[PDB]
UniProtKB/Swiss-Prot annotation:
This is Serine/threonine-protein kinase PAK 4. It comes from the Eukaryota. Interacts with FGFR2 and GRB2. Interacts tightly with GTP-bound but not GDP-bound CDC42/p21 and weakly with RAC1. Interacts with INKA1. Interacts with SH3RF2. Interacts with RHOU and PAXI; the PAK4-RHOU complex protects RHOU from ubiquitination and acts as a scaffold to suppport paxillin/PAXI phosphorylation. Residues 24-275 form the Protein kinase domain. Residues 1-26 are annotated as: GEF-interaction domain (GID). Serine/threonine-protein kinase that plays a role in a variety of different signaling pathways including cytoskeleton regulation, cell adhesion turnover, cell migration, growth, proliferation or cell survival. Activation by various effectors including growth factor receptors or active CDC42 and RAC1 results in a conformational change and a subsequent autophosphorylation on several serine and/or threonine residues. Phosphorylates and inactivates the protein phosphatase SSH1, leading to increased inhibitory phosphorylation of the actin binding/depolymerizing factor cofilin. The active site is at 143 (proton acceptor). It is found in: Cytoplasm. Belongs to the protein kinase superfamily. STE Ser/Thr protein kinase family. STE20 subfamily. The chain holds residues 298 to 591 of 591 of the full protein. Highest expression in prostate, testis and colon.
Length: 294
């Protein structure tokens, strides 16, 4: 029996108090996640562009996850993680004022264009460098996908949408809770078992299929049957298994391991040769819609 009020009071302390509508003006909606809207605003004083994630407290499936965002954006800061400026509380909504990422989402790049290996390797590297820090401090970002990955004007990768991450300790080292995007889920999570931080390594594997094949495995299928197939059947494979290098296939084989105990860790993968192909963040800039002619 956690009242809507008792909850608000819990956030009232962890957030920046006051009304952010005081110093922000140019509110226009850019996109929409499962949690809420990512409406972008302009500052009055600086005159700079910032993203403002509004999320309703009442309209939530798992309400106590709202903490994840802000609680990870701070205490877990990094070059390949999004920067949060502030976080306020308004009416019945949670407003998180964040850095504006000019490059946009990865979803756009993979669907419309085909990335070469040197670009794909750069993205995987940046994510692992972010994960290796999170996993080491005991964090599981349980919703890894192209939709959660944002890019800068440089093309520098930034992991985002932390709402679906989880904390683990020596007391509670694993979790059962079912969280993430059906298609990018690891089997042990789909099966509703104790899952450690290796769920993200499978999910990163599914993103590599998304990066190559444009969409993830069994995507055209319904959501419930897609999971049954990932859980029951063999590790999913690429359609373009002929175009990929010997290195990439060998890399992805360590990501898409069904048995979590056998599936590679974050630290392990950083040493893998494939990530030597990783091209400069500037090599992603041409593939960004802004510069795409169509």
């Amino acid at each position: 029996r956690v009242s809507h009020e008792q909850f608000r009071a819990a956030l009232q302390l962890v957030v920046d108090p006051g009304d952010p509508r005081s110093y922000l003006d140019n509110f226009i909606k850019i996109g929409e996640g499962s949690t809420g809207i990512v409406c972008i605003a302009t500052v009055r004083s600086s005159g700079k562009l910032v993203a403002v994630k509004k999320m309703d407290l009442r309209k939530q499936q798992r309400r106590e996850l709202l903490f994840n965002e802000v609680v990870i954006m701070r205490d877990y800061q990094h070059e390949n993680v999004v920067e949060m400026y502030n976080s306020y509380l308004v009416g019945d909504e949670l407003w998180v004022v964040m850095e504006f990422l000019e490059g946009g989402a990865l979803t756009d790049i993979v669907t419309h264009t085909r990335m070469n290996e040197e670009q794909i390797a750069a993205v995987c590297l940046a994510v692992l460098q972010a994960l290796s820090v999170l996993h080491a401090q005991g964090v599981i970002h349980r919703d890894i996908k192209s939709d959660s990955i944002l890019l800068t004007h440089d093309g520098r990768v930034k992991l985002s949408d932390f709402g679906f991450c989880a904390q683990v300790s020596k007391e509670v080292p694993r979790r059962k809770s079912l969280v993430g995007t059906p298609y990018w889920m690891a089997p042990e999570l789909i099966s509703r078992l104790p899952y450690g931080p290796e769920v993200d390594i499978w999910s990163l594997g599914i993103m590599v299929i998304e990066m190559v094949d444009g969409e993830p495995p069994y995507f055209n299928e319904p959501p419930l049957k897609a999971m049954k197939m990932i859980r029951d059947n063999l590790p999913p494979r690429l359609k373009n298994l002929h175009k990929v290098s010997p290195s990439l296939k060998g890399f992805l084989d360590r990501l898409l391991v069904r048995d979590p105990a056998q599936r590679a860790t974050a630290a392990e993968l950083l040493k893998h040769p494939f990530l030597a192909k990783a091209g400069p963040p500037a090599s992603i800039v041409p593939l960004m819609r802004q510069n795409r002619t169509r």
